[PDB]
Each structure stands twice: as C-alpha cells, then as structure tokens.
Write a protein that binds this ligand. Sequence first.
Ligand code: MG
Ligand code: MG
Lengths: 362, 364
Amino acid sequence: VSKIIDIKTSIIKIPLKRTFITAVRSTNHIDSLAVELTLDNGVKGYGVAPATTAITGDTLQGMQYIIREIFAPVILGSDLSDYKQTLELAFKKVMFNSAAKMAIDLAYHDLLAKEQDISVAKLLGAKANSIVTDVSISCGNVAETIQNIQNGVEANFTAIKVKTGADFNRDIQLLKALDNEFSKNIKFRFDANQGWNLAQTKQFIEEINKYSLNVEIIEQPVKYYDIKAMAEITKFSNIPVVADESVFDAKDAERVIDEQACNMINIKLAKTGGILEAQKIKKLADSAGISCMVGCMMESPAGILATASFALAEDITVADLDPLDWVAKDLYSDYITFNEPNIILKDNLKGFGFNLAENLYF
Amino acid sequence: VSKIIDIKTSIIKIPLKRTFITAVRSTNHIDSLAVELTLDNGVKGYGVAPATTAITGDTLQGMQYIIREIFAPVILGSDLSDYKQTLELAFKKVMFNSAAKMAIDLAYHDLLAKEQDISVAKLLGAKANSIVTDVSISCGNVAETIQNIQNGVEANFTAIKVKTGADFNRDIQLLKALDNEFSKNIKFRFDANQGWNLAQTKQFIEEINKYSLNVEIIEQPVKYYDIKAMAEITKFSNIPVVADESVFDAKDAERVIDEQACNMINIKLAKTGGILEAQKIKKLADSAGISCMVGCMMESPAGILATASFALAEDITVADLDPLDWVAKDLYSDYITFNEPNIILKDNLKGFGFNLAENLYFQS
Ligand SMILES: [Mg+2]
Ligand SMILES: [Mg+2]
C-alpha cells in the first residue's frame, strides 16, 4: 500500500514567443506552479497549473501557501488508493483557488498512472493519441486580424478562434472582411470573453447570417453570471453557444443545463480544479445532451498535455489548445509532437511524461 | 487635489481567547492583512481584512501579491477623488479574492473621511453611534454549548448565535436543552454554515416549533449554491431565512432576490470586497423588500469597526459582530467601547481611528 510522504512546490516561468495581451493584462511569460508528490516507494508525480488571476483568482503565492499549509497536512501520510476521499477532504478546506486544486489533482493522476506503468491518457481510458486545435487570434483592427488569420491558414490550421468583444464595431466590420477573404473550408470560433451585451450578441449573429461563413461556435458572449441572457442567446442563436466562464465546476454545469444556457461547455482544468471535477462535468453534460470542448489558459505545455489526455479519454474532439504555438518546441518535444493543427502524444510515456529536473533539481 | 503615492502592508496575527468552531472549520487565531495608503500631503489611510481561505478563498500571501503587484500600479499616482474609477479598474483585474479588495476599499474610505476631518461613520452618513451584537457559540456537545451560552448571558448578551450543522443529531438534542435552560428574553439565531441538507433543515425548523424558544433567524442552512433548496426552505419556514455564503456581491443578491431564496441577506465586507459593493447590495435588498443584517468573519476588531460604521449609515440594526468578545480588549479600546452587547463608536476619531502604525511595521 503506497502512501504519499512528501510534497514540494516550485514556480516555473516560461517565456512567450510574442507578447500575450488580454482585456486586463499584458505579459511575455507564463506563470506556473508545479507540485511534486512522493510516495514511500520512491515514485514521484507532478502537476502544473497557471496563476491566471483575472479568471480564476489564483496567484502563485496563494497556491504555494495553500498546497504547503492547507492541503499537505491532509495528504501527507495518506494512502494513494484513497485519493478520491483525500482530495475531497483537502479541497473542502479552500473556497475557489481552482488552479491550486488542479496542480494537486494532476500530480495524483500522474502517480496513479506511474503505479501502473502507463500514461495518464491510458489510465483515463484513452486509446487515440491525437487532437486537433484551433489557432487563437488576438483582438486587433480589421486588417491586422485578417493578416493574422491568413498566417494561421498558411500554417495549416483550419479552425480559427477569433477573439472579439473589445471593439464591437470592429467585430461587426470584421465579418464582412471574413466573408470576402475566406472560404467555408475555414471554420470560425468567436470568443467575446464576456464583452458583448445581449443586443450586441443578437446583432453579431444576425450579421454572420447575412454572409456565407462557416462559424461553429459563439463562446461566452455576455458576463459569466448573466445566465438569463446566455439562455436567451442560446434560444435565439442558430449557432452553437459555448459557456466558458459561466462554467467552472459541476454545480455550474448543473445550472447552465437546468437553465438551458448553452449548447456546449468549454472545460478547462484550471477552472475545474483538475481531472476528477472535469469528469463530473462531462458526465452531467452527456446526460443532458450538451456537448463539451476543452480549452486552457495561456499555460505551460504540461497543462496542455494533461488537458489533451483528458479530452482523448472523454471523446472530446473540439479543442482550443494553442499555447503550444506561443512557446519553444523544446519545452514539450519530450512528450508532444505539434504538427499543426495536430497535438500528438508521444508513445510509451509513464504518467504524463514530463519531469521537473531543470526546475526542482538542476 | 491629493494623490496616492505609496502603498504598504503588514500582516496581523491575533490569538482567540477560546476556540471558534463551525461546521466548516475550527481555529484559535485570526490571520489578517493591513494596508496603508499614503497621500502626497502625508495623510495615511488604513484597511484590514481577514484571510479566511475556507470561506472567501483569500490567503495572506495572495492578498499581499494582489495588493502590491496588481492593484498598486493602478492606484499609485492616482488622485484620491478618482477612487471609484480606480477601484473599478483595479478590481476587474482579479477574480474572487474579495478580502484583498475589502482592505483596499476600507483604506480609501479612511482617506476620504480623514481628508474631510470626520469619522468614516460620519462620512457615510451615520447618525447613531451604537449597535447591538449577538455573541456566537462554537459547535460542541450539548453540555459545553449550554455552558458557553450561559457565559454569554452573564456577560450581558441576549442575542445568541448558535453554530449548528456539524452534527445534526446534536443540533436536534440541543433544542431540548435551550428550552430547559433559557427564557424567551434570550433570542436565538441558528447558523449551520451550509452543513444541513434540505430534509434536515425542515426537520430542524419543525423541531424548534415543538418548544417555546424565541428564534430570530435560520442562517445559510444548505450549500451556498443550492439556491433551489434555499427557496424551498424560505417558503417552508415561519422563521426568517438568511443567505450568508450564498450572497457575496450585488449580482449574488440579484439572484437570491429573483429566486425568492432568502428573507434577509447577511452582508459582510470580507465577501463584498468593501463598502462600495456592500452599499449596492443594500440598495437592491431595499428595492426588493428584503432585509439586511451585518456579519463578519472571525476577524480583527478593525473590520468590526468598519462594518459597524456601514451598518449605522445604512440603518441596519441586526448584527453578528462578536469577534470583539473573542480577543483582548486592548486590540479595540482605542476606537470602540464594547459595553456588551453594545458596540459604541468612540467620539471625534478621524477616519476609522484604528491607530495601526503604532504597533505594526508597514512595508512596500
Ligand atoms: Mg440555439
Ligand atoms: Mg473562452
């Protein structure tokens, strides 16, 4: 019977290839916390999670304190086989801070898989090793945005996530330029990041329908708490509506199902607090006939690998996992081949297949 | 025109005189972060907030980073009179961490009042200076619970908040003992901290009504997100039902109003992220005919004073602000007279009057 007898954490900062700009922040790096769990047979497991404070409220400093001072006393000395119960006991001591939970949940899965000498994807039941991602396009003026999209098409992507909601007039004009520059072989996914109101959303959908575009989803058009508007939009729309910030966890999923507020849920492990909770959402969505995609924060390739592993296990094929495009290939080439637009897991990995040598020990 | 030109913080740790135990956690201490904003005319403004990780998710470490690295660049160099714009822009950068936001909102209020040479209570429009609080009673076995209640009664408390929800069988048996021990001049407020399910909550309310107790509220009996059960309990109960963890901010207040999920909201500045957001909740509750009380985390007396100042300005008279009863009197005697059960603001204080720099070393 294996027991967890040590926990360490380490902060990992990864430089980005270009500057990443959100509605509230600009950065040239990814902030992550890694956690290492050590079993009394010597097997070590790792989880890595981002500190995206504007979305999940996590900070590196908060996560470190939580893991060392709050989760560690619950985990330490406990049997690996009781992980479901251990995590439930640990997590009930902390409201929010979902990324700190993610790091812990992922390290546990890495241990479970390593104990069976298999990959985490295999542990979770995956057989396929490859998932398609869109490429993400930052907000910009119409011309810069058309060019960015072109460069994406040229790099082999055919699913294009277009960020909107900063300049509604730009969003509207953009659709005309889209209809003129691209064929229905290009599939568009718009993510307003809560930037539109109800009237704007309806209008944007109307403008789309004035053209001949291939648009597969409209993601989180309005504020995360406006479940009434989301439901009104879902009913109005002839295009799949995706809940992102409206759904972190399973009880959020229950509410959007109950209120019919989306057609599809965007699962991210940084919101769910890891794989166990993401599996609960996927089971609720299936029962409701609601589909799921997977997404991520701007986060390290380790988070992307864990998310891809979950998706492959859950028969989720729609994915927005393009942070691999923002970092150096050498950070992930030990476990992922990114032949755009395909994210392909390497063969015969034990657990996730990354180690934290350069961070923890070198 | 005054500009904010420095932001510094300090951790405060306070021991409790006795163990505070609820359905959610047990503790013998309070961890808080204080923030100090300095104006270019040398005036200093303070806010203090608790790190109650099991309830608001806040940590001292996350609060320090948020305040000094995320909010500070927004706040530094800005004019005091632009406080509303500045806080809105700063707070948009951070999801949750409502206690970090409370500390900053309070320091701004301290400055605003000081710049007018008045108390914060006066700035907010208070006319009264006294509010009555209950004393709250930790979860425990019946005998020790009765003793703790007797203690509170001898200290002159007549409203007693009894923590429940850790042990439902205990909660039911306790009702027999309260009825035996206390008169109806003692008013009971039960707070389950989410620990009951729907069936249990109904059974508890039925049981109360088998006895002859003076019971004022039933607070947050079920999980914070079970708004459907909250509405069912509200419709079922002859006793007012209070949302605490179900309502942190104005949009949470809208939802429980829309769903008829409570009769009263327990406003706490550690949940609302400070006074500005708490005012918005009060306005919505007034418009909906929903009453408000004020509460707190088990937190420093500085948060009690701020919360009492708000309540007095908003004509809120029902209060659970008992942490003063759990800590050394010298932590509050600079600014409050606690003639149990009355919290009385001292006269002629400028701002809140916390007097923190005397005992804490602030750093940027
Ligand atoms: Mg529809
Ligand atoms: Mg999104």
